[PDB]
Amino acid sequence: KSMNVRVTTMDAELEFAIQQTTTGKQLFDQVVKTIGLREVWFFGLQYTDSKGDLTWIKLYKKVMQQDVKKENPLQFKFRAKFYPEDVADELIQEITLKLFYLQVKNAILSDEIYCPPETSVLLASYAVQARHGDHNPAVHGPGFLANDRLLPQRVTDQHKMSREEWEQSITNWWQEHRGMLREDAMMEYLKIAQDLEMYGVNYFEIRNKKNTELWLGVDALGLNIYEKDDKLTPKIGFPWSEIRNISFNDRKFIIKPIDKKAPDFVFFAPRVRVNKRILALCMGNHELYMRRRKPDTIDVQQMKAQAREEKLAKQAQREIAARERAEKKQQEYQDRLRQMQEEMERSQANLLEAQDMILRLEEQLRQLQAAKEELEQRQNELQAMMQRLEETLEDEIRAKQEEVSRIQQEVELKDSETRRLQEEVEDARRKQDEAAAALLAATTPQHHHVAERADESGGGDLARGPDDLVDPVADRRTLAERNERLHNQLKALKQDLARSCDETKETAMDKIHRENVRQGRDKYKTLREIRKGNTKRRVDQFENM
Length: 545
Ligand SMILES: [Cl-]
Description:
It is a peripheral membrane protein. Keywords: Actin-binding, Cell junction, Cell membrane, Cell projection, Coiled coil, Cytoplasm, Cytoskeleton, Membrane. By secondary structure, the chain is α+β, with helices and mostly antiparallel strands. It folds into five domains: 2-80, Ubiquitin-like (UB roll), CATH 3.10.20; 81-197, Up-down Bundle (Acyl-CoA Binding Protein); 199-294 and 457-461, PH-domain like (Roll); 295-456, no CATH class; 463-545, Serine Threonine Protein Phosphatase 5, Tetratricopeptide repeat (Helix non-globular), CATH 6.10.360. 52% of the residues lie in helices and 13% in strands. An eight-stranded antiparallel beta sheet has the order 9-8-7-6-12-11-10-13. Strands 2-1-5-3-4 form a five-stranded mixed beta sheet. A hairpin with a 3-residue loop joins strand 7 and strand 8. Helix 4 crosses helix 6. The longest helix is centred in the middle third of the chain and has 70 residues, at 322-391. The chain is elongated and about 130 Å long. The protein starts with a strand and ends with a helix. 25% of the residues are buried. Chloride ion (CL) binds at residues 445-446.
């Protein structure tokens, strides 16, 4: 009946048992309430199904009904399913920042996302500041970074640089960050990373009516089309503000725009499973898109207020190693999970205890009204016989008058017990309400979560947005083109790395990137460009490709 599950976040493994009929949400909530995360909208639980495919957990469906690969324990990954549009403006809590930084760094380091050498190096220096704080030559000897995972394999395989050298180079830049908090180094990393061309892009293999091979790209900003040969530079794009309805039939996927003049944007997945995943991410990214176009909610403003307050609280409070910080954090999560589960079981017990009591009390309250209403009947019938026997002897009138009064004594006794039971019922309702509150204190508000697809064919209308909606890509510029310092550091790094670069080890994406840089392109320029024209124009462009 009861199942063991393991959930791995980027900074913790949590091992715990759940009930046989625990919903995806009940699992998800236990994960986040432990680590203290309230920005739930970005996140989900990946697993492997019996068919060996990566799958997200559905919140309002029993976990055992979702066909998680059968293991002991069940294996889950807590991961960001959706990225913010602008990290600097959006990420509120420290824990949400940490988990993104860790998930994105992992993508860069594992070569899921292309990151060029210069950026990789710069990013590494922010990474080490995040982990180890300020460089200090008194305490940090040479080879201090021996165990840190610094750069992507691509970037080391193509330069003639000893480990020792890479460490020194990254230490020089690390030194430039003295004074900067760990949280800021994490944010500064992401602020740099979010302008990478492959960042936040969910890719899928698709074909148009013309049967050309293409890549669809779904992100926080909209939909994008790439040629198979080039994932860094998208050729056509649609912002979320131009989309009205999404749906699929088997392998056919139909996108209907807001503009009624423009035709349906239609393409084909190689599999129905692909089209489901696409739809969910579309529904998901579109909804979060629209929230970003509206003012902050009450809960969001509270979070932000709280976040800023706890940031100053932690500043005052502020030494341990990195490996040991991680172990204590992992322990903290275990202790809170343990306490949480204990308190839940108590609250569940108290609730069922209060309910059963309430039920037994309401039966006894009817039993005391049935016994009272019987005494009232006997009183009324004793008065009727007494009035008729008095008219009709004086010894029987005393015997009847005494018994009538003694029945009133019994009514007074049972109205004192009824009075007691009343206050015991109302006390049970207090206990029930507190238990219920406690249980709900362990759930996350449902309205914070992104709406998820219900279930050969699914989909529907996307909620329209504000009447005053301005898509933010019009005004947006890369941190490099805005910040003179950043630009200069990449410029420096390009010069240093070039003097040990093995040109024979230049990957295909290296060539595409340099071409883009050479042509004055960047993530947002290219987005502005490929969105030009009306919805019809670009739906044509796609079909002709
Ligand atoms: Cl709720």
